[PDB]
Design a protein around this ligand. Structure first.
Ligand SMILES: [Mn+2]
Lengths: 202, 13, 203, 208, 13, 203, 207, 13, 13, 13
């Protein structure tokens, strides 16, 4: 049983990443926990969130029946390829708040949900009014175009149910949407997901 | 809900 | 020097894939709270310094002391072994480790691991300057394992306060660690966490 | 899927064949093209005379040992690879006050002509007097970037343009850019036979 | 522009 | 050139699972206090810079000098050898290493190791602005080894004050480092620690 | 281009040919030290810590790194990462924070076996800035020396006792009145070895 | 001690 | 420089 | 120094 999982892991373990002839869909979502701080002397906002990532690899699928009906397993995110999804407008290295561990299911799907703290460019002006401040941060692949990584958002609207009820800031609304961009210079689609948050002093 | 709980969210969100 | 070679033999004689629905693991968790360092009412963050006691047991880590010159236990670096991914669900900063990370393994397969830590977590400290004080909570639980693969226990409801720094800025009114089991409409698994709840005030 | 499988196998073969170069030398000089994309001036501290910038540092060089025939490899024209797996230039700010912080993955693209392109996002603190920032004439600060250990005989450092890219400068930053320029400088010292090259990043800015 | 978009810039800038 | 090759041969031949109840170890510990940098009365934390001297001895690092071109000692990165897990029990931030970590090893198997450190630990500095000053204390001890595996000692109870920075914001009134041996009624082992007690005031 | 290939092959050949457990009393080493002071960034009179940014020039020499240029296509020098060779453990003796490295850590090795290493550093050290706002300014000092090598294993030297100020930041909050770097040999009655250090003494004031 | 003395705690807690 | 120029200093200072 | 000189202190303090 343990034996079967060890033998499965052994069987599965090098994937060289997506290419134009082997493109990868990556699904991205956000669970917003807390806007910790909004600094109007520098125009930075610090946000604690869970970042849901999902993608699927043919190289990660197996038949449960050849392995004692294991339908999934957990593994350190260092043991596998993960996509290079990045905040394009951070002002500090992102801080990881949790272990980095994925779930791999028999169909080759990978789910990875790291907690993070992110400082990003944001003018908090209006946060002390009723209408709030509005800020936005783009995430996209660092080096893959829409031809090699097809970045999208999941069905669910932004998850607000775990947002800290006693935060110094309340979330008035949050959206996550995909943007597809084309430049005349270049043939490739360029994709980014925007997280737009509207927030004010509680 | 489930998506606020890391080990649930990872399977179903 | 014969004992040494025995220990070296036992360690090498001795790869675990982690717990599964078929081979579940019970982790016992407990806290020794040393200090509430800071309550920041401008960001609603509170910093705690504590020992986090973890205990689990693996059949693969069993041995007869008789076959190894009466070694009943040994110390090893936490990186050499599998450890549970128990984590605060609402920290606001990466947890700072204040001590070496070394576990004791006993011949019955018991593993015990007591890292010292400092944690910033989400907390509203209103009331901290009144007799009633402030109350704050944070849940601890596996990051990726449900109740079917990791069962999370405590020995006691009571957070250990025997090392609480008496000359802290904050005195403890109460400190509890409670096992909670939730089920969601969507999902068949039980999800377990330990709720660390601390009621405190300015000394 | 025959399709996916071949592209993967071809990439693995290409990489394996390419990773089978000791840095530039006087007899093998390297041209390195450097450019900046300024995202934000986050902070100007008048108490210590340090300023913090967030920028992309674009680096391009070319190596004969990274050339290949796309035809020999299922028409792969380029691949992505961790910057740690290949040699990278040692371009450094000469007047920084803190270690640079890396804001992005560090991954290069190698083209079939042997071009390597690397664009790390960074936050840098450097020596800068922000006096005059609250006036309309603004303040002016400069930092040189150059190789740490390579002279102009080994690393020939240049730009494609003198204009720092401001197309994605944060529109609600505390500071607005009056001008941002990047300029090649060559210095010759009488002690020494080598030319010494830096790119001088000059930013003129003010409070918004 | 292409040059302020990292996966474009790394390719054509 | 013969000396270089002798040194290399020695290191090769020498390069331990830690101490056990059968093979215990003595670790001698001493402090050289260099500076009290900061005393924070808003969080009751104090920052100290000091050298921490450690010495122990291993039979497994002994050699006959005559066999190795009369080499009596060498230096080596502290990573290349086992080092004791001596830790402050009540810090509030992870310890910051200010120096290289390089031990000296002698032919009799003695290891000496003196890294420089900055430590934040729990301390109410109330009265630091008076004549009597303030007093703060911090225990140092093995993280996972009891008195049965590691016997911790000090050579003197006096903390070395010979490099104390005279222009520090704080002067030292007293600095002691005292070995303490406790038995807990639960448990058969001796538990050993060294108490660093520091009395100081504003200069 | 043939010229390019031989240049690479020869360097590679030289590097493997050349590729030391540190100095000993029987095989001692001279390390020459120098400072190029760029900026005094901050002087904190609530903690008596001062922050300096500098280049720390280090130079030493090993027979085991000598080659004949002629046997290797006239390669007279090469660059290698500082972590691929041995380096001296020259350290500030009175810092208050771990030293921060501000630059790549890359050494140059010349054909006569000189190794030269110039990391840029930010250093916090013990310093009382009282006087900094007066015409006489403040004076501070920090000693640099080996961490574990006595003067029998590492002879520590300077080329000058004058700190290089040609590069000092002209709009620093602080003006430099003088900056010296003095080699001091010291014997202690307890002990047989000489101990060497370089004393960096900076006199400075508010600009 | 015992549960606040790390080397005790790691044995009997 | 020369001695305030890292790649010059590293050869000649 | 001796005890305030790390390469001395490591040997005799
Ligand atoms: Mn030829």
């Amino acid at each position: 049983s343990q034996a079967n999982l060890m033998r499965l892991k052994s069987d599965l373990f090098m994937y060289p990443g997506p290419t134009k002839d082997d493109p990868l869909t990556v699904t991205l979502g956000f669970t917003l926990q807390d806007i910790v701080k909004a600094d109007s002397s520098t125009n930075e906002v610090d946000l604690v969130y869970y970042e849901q990532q999902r993608w699927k690899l043919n190289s990660l699928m197996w038949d449960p029946n050849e392995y004692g009906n294991i339908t999934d397993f957990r593994t350190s995110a260092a043991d596998i390829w993960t996509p290079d999804i990045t905040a394009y407008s951070s002002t500090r290295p992102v801080q990881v708040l949790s272990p980095q561990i994925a779930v791999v299911t028999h169909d080759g799907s990978v789910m990875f949900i790291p907690a993070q703290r992110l400082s990003f460019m944001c003018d908090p002006t209006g946060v002390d009014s009723e209408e709030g401040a509005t800020c936005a941060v783009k995430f996209g692949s660092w080096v893959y175009s829409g031809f090699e990584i097809d970045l999208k958002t999941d069905t669910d609207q932004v998850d607000l149910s775990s947002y800290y009820a006693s935060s110094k800031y309340e979330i008035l609304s949050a959206t996550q949407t995909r943007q597809v961009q084309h430049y005349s210079c270049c043939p490739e689609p360029y994709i980014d997901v925007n997280l737009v948050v509207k927030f004010r002093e509680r | 809900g489930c998506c606020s709980t890391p080990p649930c969210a990872v399977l179903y969100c």
